[PDB]
From Swiss-Prot, chain C:
Function: Forms an icosahedral capsid of pseudo T=3 symmetry with capsid proteins VP2 and VP3. The capsid is 300 Angstroms in diameter, composed of 60 copies of each capsid protein and enclosing the viral positive strand RNA genome.
UniProt name for this protein: Capsid protein VP3
Subunit structure: Interacts with capsid protein VP0 and capsid protein VP1 to form heterotrimeric protomers. Five protomers subsequently associate to form pentamers which serve as building blocks for the capsid. Interacts with capsid protein VP4 in the mature capsid. Interacts with protein 2C; this interaction may be important for virion morphogenesis.
Localisation per UniProt entry: Virion; Host cytoplasm
Amino acid sequence: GAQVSSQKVGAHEINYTTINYYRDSASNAASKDFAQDPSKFTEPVKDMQLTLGNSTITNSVVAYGRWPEYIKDSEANPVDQPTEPAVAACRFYTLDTVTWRKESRGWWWKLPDALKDMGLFGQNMFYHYLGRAGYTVHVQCNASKFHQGALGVFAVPEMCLAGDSTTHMFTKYENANPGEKGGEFKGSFTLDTNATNPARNFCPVDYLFGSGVLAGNAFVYPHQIINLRTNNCATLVLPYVNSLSIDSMTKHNNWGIAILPLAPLDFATESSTEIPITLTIAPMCCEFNGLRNITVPRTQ
Amino acid sequence: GAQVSSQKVGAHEINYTTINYYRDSASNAASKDFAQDPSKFTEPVKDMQLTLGNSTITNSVVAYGRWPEYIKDSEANPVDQPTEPAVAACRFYTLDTVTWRKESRGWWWKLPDALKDMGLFGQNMFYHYLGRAGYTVHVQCNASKFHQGALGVFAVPEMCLAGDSTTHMFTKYENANPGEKGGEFKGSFTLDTNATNPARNFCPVDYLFGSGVLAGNAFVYPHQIINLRTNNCATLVLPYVNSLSIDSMTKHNNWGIAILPLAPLDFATESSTEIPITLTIAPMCCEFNGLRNITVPRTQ
Amino acid sequence: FCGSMMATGKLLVSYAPPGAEAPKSRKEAMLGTHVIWDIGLQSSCTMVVPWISNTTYRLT
């Protein structure tokens, strides 16, 4: 059972044979213009009015070109019946509005963490052992034609943020899951030296994107730019991304949302100018498994 | 357009004509062995192991011979999408166990009131304006072969209970909706004369079935008897019953459960004997409409 | 159940998937998977704990 493959000859003066000797395939040797070869990695658009449940919204990227979907029967690990709340949980929830000033270094949120106290979605999340959902994130920021500024919105799978102490991986659960308030990036790294009552919080540096990588490369993640001269809003459609078909929503945050001011806010000649940014997130294709008594995580 | 109908002649010495003169049909005149003619009114049985959601139970009546069912599109009043929690809410919840003694006069509960604090069913009930569900009620009471006693379990649609004051219909919402603890029948009617701080509670007299009707006739309602010498439990399958296809679960209780000791409990020669009664209720074919902020009814 | 034939009773056997506080009373255990066992009727009861896990395998 010999495999006769062809070689690619370079310097000329053409087939090579390979035979597998082991039953386990892990023992085998390795076999080896503007158009984007990886069209799915260049933030493909949905190519209006988005209605989910009883919520309606009137610049849309699909992360990795993959729309949210339910678990295939071929890839279902759990065996118990899945709860699908449907319109009850799959609807747009509006988080607390943040304020963009000339001095803002950026904001961040975690999903599903930011929606843990959002109507029936939070109830289903805390009542079940396993949960899964994609998202539609709508960032809203409007300003006059005389305002200038640009925001970069990034959806990062496994958005791990650096700590603030010499102790590695020391950020406690409460500070890593702030909820809908989220957190803010910082312009510099400040080390927490309070060995008695350590803050045990993140210290996400903006130009390091909070994880030791240059912010300029954050555009490799699914992203959208809100340039105030052009558009008001940004829509990101995030499919469920994980190494598992379904996981624990309380333990693990599948996505992170980062908003960084790429161009600082400015207006006329008023040094005092602030415009709100409003996030509206709708979970999509929710499904839960493992119903039992409700989880009540520790707070503060 | 004359209607020629036939008469039924009695005393003989045969058709009569009728014509409708008005456009509105309300103006029309009226046109006119052991086998039970109303088989559905004689508590038909389900003719083991009942599994609903993740709950399993190992003498079953279907009230009015009508199994629980979802709203037909032909009879849907609300137009918004209905939330159907499915296995998340449709599962067996076990209420607080009561104690049957020689002196007990009976117990009562209201549905959906008794399940208002039961997992995700209560959350869905309090998050939605409209709710609908049938039920499977499993009453459990086991005793030795040397115990004697009989319980009558009755499912009453629109089980309205009499008050305790000269003021008509004066029972307040809190006392009319006790939750899973329910209430107890009394052997006599006691008038509440505290005009300063009236109890505003029910006074359900057992032999009056709490509503001014003789208890002996309560068997016209869907019912099942737990006779200790014969059976341990009783299963009642209640369809949704109302003048509307869907209503408010917080305002209105569709069913009432009444357990009356038909034969008093007795055992050997111990005057001190008590056996528990445990109720397990599973809502069925749940559907909710009108999602908004959660309702928080006043308590105590 | 290894009591006398004259003994009767009903028990509840519950499995709760992880993540929440371990059930401390029947009120909590009843919210998870559970079976009701009539010992007077059956001497043996069988409950299947179905495979529900985030990972495809659990460590031993």
